[PDB]
Amino acid sequence: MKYLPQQDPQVFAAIEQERKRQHAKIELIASENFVSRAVMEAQGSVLTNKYAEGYPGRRYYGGCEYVDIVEELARERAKQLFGAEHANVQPHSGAQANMAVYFTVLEHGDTVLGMNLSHGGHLTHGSPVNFSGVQYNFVAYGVDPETHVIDYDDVREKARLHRPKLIVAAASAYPRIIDFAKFREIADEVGAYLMVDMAHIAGLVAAGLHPNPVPYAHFVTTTTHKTLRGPRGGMILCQEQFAKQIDKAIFPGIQGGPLMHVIAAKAVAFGEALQDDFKAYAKRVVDNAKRLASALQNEGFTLVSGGTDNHLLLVDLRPQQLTGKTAEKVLDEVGITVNKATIPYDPESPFVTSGIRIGTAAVTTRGFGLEEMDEIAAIIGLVLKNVGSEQALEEARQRVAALTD
Amino acid sequence: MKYLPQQDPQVFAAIEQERKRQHAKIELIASENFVSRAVMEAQGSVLTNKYAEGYPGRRYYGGCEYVDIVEELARERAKQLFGAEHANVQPHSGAQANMAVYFTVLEHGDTVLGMNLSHGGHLTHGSPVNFSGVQYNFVAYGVDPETHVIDYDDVREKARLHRPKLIVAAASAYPRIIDFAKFREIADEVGAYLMVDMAHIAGLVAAGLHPNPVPYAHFVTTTTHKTLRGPRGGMILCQEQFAKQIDKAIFPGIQGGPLMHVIAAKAVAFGEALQDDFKAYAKRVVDNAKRLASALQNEGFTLVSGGTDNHLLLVDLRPQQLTGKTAEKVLDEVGITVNKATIPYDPESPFVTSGIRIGTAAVTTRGFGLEEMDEIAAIIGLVLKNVGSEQALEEARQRVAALTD
Fold it and tell me: Which residues bind pyridoxal 5'-phosphate 1 (chains A, B) (predicted)?
């Protein structure tokens, strides 16, 4: 940076702290990643100055010739990446992407069927403190209490009983492949739309490492910033028959001016994802998660569902008589960043929990591989088996530093 | 830029076109401005990588120590700027800022009283194609048909007849000072909350050049990117008694992860606004608008309300027998960027209009003064009086180029 250090010492000092923090810590928050310098440059461009309400070639302000090119690059690359008939790259966030789809097909009070929030469903999939649960009548399907895999007969029974207008598939904390064909079959049986929120797995889908929901879903929502490794924001993919309605839902429906600089960054990220090396990266993400899962089991940990098919895993800490809150806190003390996470049928509140959620997308981006996964697992074992030993924690601290250099 | 040109030639070429466009054109879109290089650097930072759901010291992810500092700088500087008891700097946009306030105090179908959308009210103040008009029962107050000033007796009568739960004051296209004391008096009479959407005038308020709504309103919403000259995003200011509810409305209510890099940029912009030179800038904005208004009248144009108290003006083109659409198109041909705009009691549709909206915030930022205002007015006169003369338009083109250098 050249201008920020002089203009705003306070903001610059804090940014620099954060930059150094990102290098020093082992980031295992499953939703996090590190964007490229090109992506950041796009976000830091003069495109922030441009009002561009509307869509390419159909704006409500003049002078959009070039931001139109950028938005079209985003849309076309997204369609190339996911094979969707239509893309809307304007959503400000995953929240807004979901909000727009709900606004498109639902009326206030309509019934929606989503994944149980304590089994891996997201806040925007019906939390009673979120607009989704306040605006619509959400019911939930569960995972099996033993296998922790989605119970598709439960999905079906809930659908048939409650007659939702919309079924939502996808998750913030589900470590296994989701069967979108089965979701669509159930949706078809009850005459409901199917929306897939692929936010967590979008990069894996792009790389052909998770089945693509696009052929099965009426709507697919996603964030651009998780496994897709793009800037912070949202996106909607849909069948051509919904394109007009979806676009109108985003604007004038729920948003105003789009963030053209973020949309530029989206295009850049999609460009990166189209490259062969992104596919290699995504395979390493999945390989690393499997290796980490296996290595954790070797250390004596129980995993929700017994492992992972994707980028993330959940440790069930009950065998160690630890809460997720306790584990999260002590791991923070040694420089490992995880989330506490509710495990299916968790006896604890969502504010305490019996689990931790871990993902490999970020550490894979920084070049970690199989050997590093083994060491991360070993450090976690050292820490969680010795929460009362400051010497153990200092050893862990030193081993964490050895990994980040 | 260093990395974008190599990574993504297509996106870079388009960004460069847009950058050159921003220099070449005379930007008179009233909502637009040019942010500082420091603001852009903040937006282009590694803060995009950080999930920070929740609030400073009360996050749902570890590792937020430094993004907390940044968000607190934004909040404290906002409070310094506007004298508000509480600030929420997380809204992704003006749309989301407004959405959150509505979510806080209103239930589905509640009555809200806002400014007539054809008299200067915003889309999010009750458009039937916007969430506001779909989710809530919006009624409208008008301006006087002669003076084009808000008719406060109409505000009062509409309030007393319809008994709104919330009254909204503020505008996207109102060229005069708004009397917030009168709005609060009316709100008090009918037992309604008062929300002021100061998006357009926020920079002028910060500079003491428009009365501050903060002392009179329960809620004040704003964008950070118009006269405030910050990054693209939103903000809510409110009394301490609503702080908890407002924060919960933003998260977990209507958004998820905040854009920490944009929030950094917000802090930077607020820092800039606190400086003496921003106050000088804002006075030049208002001075320039008055001069431009006077110069346009000298050229024979009629202005809505007969002039301006702020950064913006509206030309009523009926005396010239032109539509706003026609004027917007031909001005585009010569390198002057304006919006078509409905004038109060406009005989034309909102897609054609009888007016153009013009603001001075952007040209003032690039250093234009009184002499430049005279020339802009003269060029507009030349163009709109000679729409069928290619020689006149070429002269205009040359004079526009002379201004931008």
Answer: 51, 93-95, 122, 172, 200, 225, 257
Q: Domain residues of chain B, as ranges? A: 1-32+284-405, 33-283
Helices (H), A197-305: 202-206, 240-248, 260-273, 276-298
Q: Specify the resolution in Å.
A: 1.7
CB pairs under 8 A between A and B: 271
- Count CB atoms within 10 A of the CB of residue B157: 13
Please confirm, yes or no, whether B385 is among the known catalytic residues.
no
Amino acid at A98: N
CA B329 to CA B197: how far, in whole Å? 30
Q: Is the distance from CB of B203 to CB of B227 less than 8 angstroms?
A: yes
**β-sheet with A339-341: strand ranges across:** A302-303, A312-316, A355-359, A339-341
Residue A48: Cβ within 10 Å count: 26
CATH no. for A1-32+284-405: 3.90.1150.10
Please provide the CATH number assigned to the domain covering B33-283. Answer: 3.40.640.10
Q: How far apart are the first and last CA of chain A?
A: 24
The single residue listed with the structure tokens 């003269």 is: B378
Q: Compute how many other C-beta atoms are within 10 angstroms of the C-beta atom of residue B280.
A: 11
Phi, psi of A355 (to 5 degrees): -140, 170
DSSP B3-37: SHHHH-HHHHHHHHHHHHHHHHSEE--TT-----H
Instruction: Tell me how crowded residue A189 is: count the other CB atoms within 10 A of its CB.
Output: 11
Interchain CB contact of B26 with A (< 8 Å): no
Query: What's B388's DSSP letter?
Result: T
Cis preceding linkage at B252, omega within 30: yes
Question: In angstroms, how far is CA B378 from the centroid of its own chain?
Answer: 26
- The shortest CB-CB distance from B51 to any of A31, A43, A264 is to A31
Residue with tokens 């205002």: B373
Q: What is the DSSP string of A248-271?
A: HIIIIII--S--HHHHHHHHHHHH
Cβ atoms B337, B404 nearer than 8 A: no
Give CA A316 to chain center in angstroms.
21
Instruction: Give the minimum alpha-carbon distance from B189 to chain A in angstroms, rounded to a whole number.
Output: 30
